[PDB]
Amino acid sequence: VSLMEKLKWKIKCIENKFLNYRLTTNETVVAETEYGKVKGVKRLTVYDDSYYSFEGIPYAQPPVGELRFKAPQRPTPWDGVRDCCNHKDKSVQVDFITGKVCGSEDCLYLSVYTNNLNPETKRPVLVYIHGGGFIIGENHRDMYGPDYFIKKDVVLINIQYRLGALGFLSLNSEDLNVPGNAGLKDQVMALRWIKNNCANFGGNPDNITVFGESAGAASTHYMMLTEQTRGLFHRGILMSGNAICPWANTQCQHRAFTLAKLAGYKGEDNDKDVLEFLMKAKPQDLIKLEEKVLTLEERTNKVMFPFGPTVEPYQTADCVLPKHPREMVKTAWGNSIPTMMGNTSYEGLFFTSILKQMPLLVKELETCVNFVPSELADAERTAPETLEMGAKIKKAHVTGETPTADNFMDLCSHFYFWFPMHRLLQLRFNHTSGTPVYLYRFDFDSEDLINPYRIMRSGRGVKGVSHTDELTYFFWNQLAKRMPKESREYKTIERMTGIWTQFATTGNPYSNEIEGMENVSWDPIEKSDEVYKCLNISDELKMIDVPEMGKIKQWESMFEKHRDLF
Structure with a gap:
């Protein structure tokens, strides 16, 4: 990222800190948790609303020393009042703005927000899990500010x-107790705390919605698939993603050795000796080198990240993914709760x-053989069958004699x-009680209000609604400003947070009290639907047939001779 966005972001970081001190109040409050008392503080928003803020609540033991790479354990309870008027640090990660490593291993916390600590009725609970390819992200309010949602x-x-x-x-080795998916197991334990x-x-506690x-x-989606979380929540919202996405799992059991070798390890490829080295390495050395782990073959086959969710090699007490995600959908408890899913109108613009x-x-x-x-x-992507599949993909997106950047995106x-998403809906249909799934398409384009992901995708002055463009209308961030x-833009914040809270409350996204929704008939997707319908969200809200549907069927025809793998 550029030297200009580096000094620019540095200034916004200094501004967000002064604004945050300014928007702080003297009204501390104390709440009960099953681990002891926590002290929160009331804060202000630029729209002159206020909310109670409990930050840095630990939901697990700090996963340092001998707990590194290990499943998480419950934290130690305390007497007295734990201070929660400040954020803790983020997970160790590469800062996308600077390129430097930041964060700390002591990262397992959650933040709680609400405009009223003593409501006269029990409120719908919304749990946000941030994205970031499992390698970046945080719950700090400079990126995920609760300001829009606490109007509700x-x-x-x-x-x-x-x-x-x-x-x-x-x-792989069952003796060392590092099956994988530690970060997912973190999410499970936080869900248990929230419950x-x-x-x-x-x-x-009987009306909890998880989204991300x-x-x-x-x-x-993983939290909806695994037995570990059965009955913990009651609604799910999948925004531009799910677990059968090609980037959302990887078999990385061999990549530990590689990482160890990049970090200066000397010796053989057995797990034990590899683990011992990694266990004493500086956290920020491991994270800085993760970029270098993938082979050129792996990048060629569109493997996006070296470490990520995985089929665990053996089962243990806190196992989360014991089978490939496609297999888990077949028994998943989450298939039987109300679900909403969607995408933006130009995802790949990212x-x-x-x-x-x-x-x-x-x-x-x-030839498009790399995207099959x-x-x-096949390995080399050179078989005639693979060139055949690649051709079907090519027909879907290459508009001219030569492919362009727009074809690519x-x-x-x-x-x-x-x-x-398509593969998931069709798999779920064959394995579900018949609870509704609702679709949306986010199609609202604006440059007048943005979020920090736009700095990374170099989306400055780029028309079209990219992946992450919608976050701007759910959360406050240090690049936001008060909108008339x-x-x-303000209307879209209102609509977006209105629908999400309406869905959270009732398992049904439609409300006539949401402006623009008066002619809307939002019906869920049925197994017998040849064509998906979705609420298209732009300057106006309109029910439409998913525009991406023809290209989706084109991709599905690659599985004409291998329908078992679909």
Whole structure:
């Protein structure tokens, strides 16, 4: 990221800190938790609303020393009052703005927010799991400010979880107790905490909604798939992602050795000796080198991250993913709760930045063999069958004689997002009680209000609604400003938070008290639907057939001769 966005962000970081001190009040309050008392503080928003803020609540033991790479354990309770008027640090990670490593291993906390600690009725609880490809992200309010949501009468909770190799290291040997998915196990334990403690903050423990975007959507989906969380919550929202996305799981059992070797390890490839080295390495050395772990073959086969959620090699006490996600959908308790899913109108637009550095990537669309689902494609991507599948993909997105950057970004939309959603809906249909799933499409474009992901994707002055463009209308961030209440952006905040809270409350997203929704008939998707219908969200709200549907069926026809793998 540029020297200009570095000094620019540095200034906004200094501004957000002064604004945060300014928007703080003297009204501290104390709440009960099952681990002891916590002290929160009341804060202000730029729209002159206020909320109670409990930050840095530990939901697990700090996963340092001998707990590194290990499943999390419950934290130690305290007497007295724990100070929660400040944020703790984020997980160790590479800062996308600077490129420096930041964060700390002591990262397992959650934050709780609400406009009223003593509501006269129990409120719907909303749990946000942040995205960031399982390698970046945080629950700090400079990125995920509760300001928009606390205009509503909900309890909003933002969690953190271990990222990167520290969150997702996986070793085959059953004796060392590092099956993988530690970061997901973090999320489970936070869900358990939220279930037993939200009532102390005015939350209804029988009405909990979990949601997230990108990796957060995949996380949300995993929390719906695993037996570990059965009955913990009651609604789910998958925003631009789920667990059968190609980027949302990887078999990384061999990559530990590689990481150890990048970090200066001397010796052989057995897990024990590898683990011993990694266990004493500086956290920020491991994270800084994760970028270098993937082979050129792996990057070629579109493996996006070295460490991430994985099928665990053996089962233990806190096992989360004992089988491939497609298999888990077949018994998943979460299939039987109300679900909403969606995508933006131009997801792949996110990859503008990557294309700018590698224009050679556009030539991949000459045969498109690299984008054929990996379970179908051959190693070298040279078999005639693979060239055949690649051709069907090519027909879907190459509009001219030569592929363009726009063709490319349009393909990514489907490869990374629309096609996986399709596969999930059809799999779920064969294995469900018949609880509704609702679809939306986020199509509202604006440059007048943005979020920090736009700095990373180099989305400055770029038309179209990219992946993460919607976050701006759910959460306050240090690049936000107060918007006139009649502006299109303000109306979209209102609509977006209105629908999400309406869904959270009732398991049904429709409300006539939401402006623009008076002609809306939002029906869920049925197994017998050849065509998906979705609430299209732009300047107006309108029910439509998903525009991406023809290209989706094109991708599905790759599985004409392998219908078992669909």
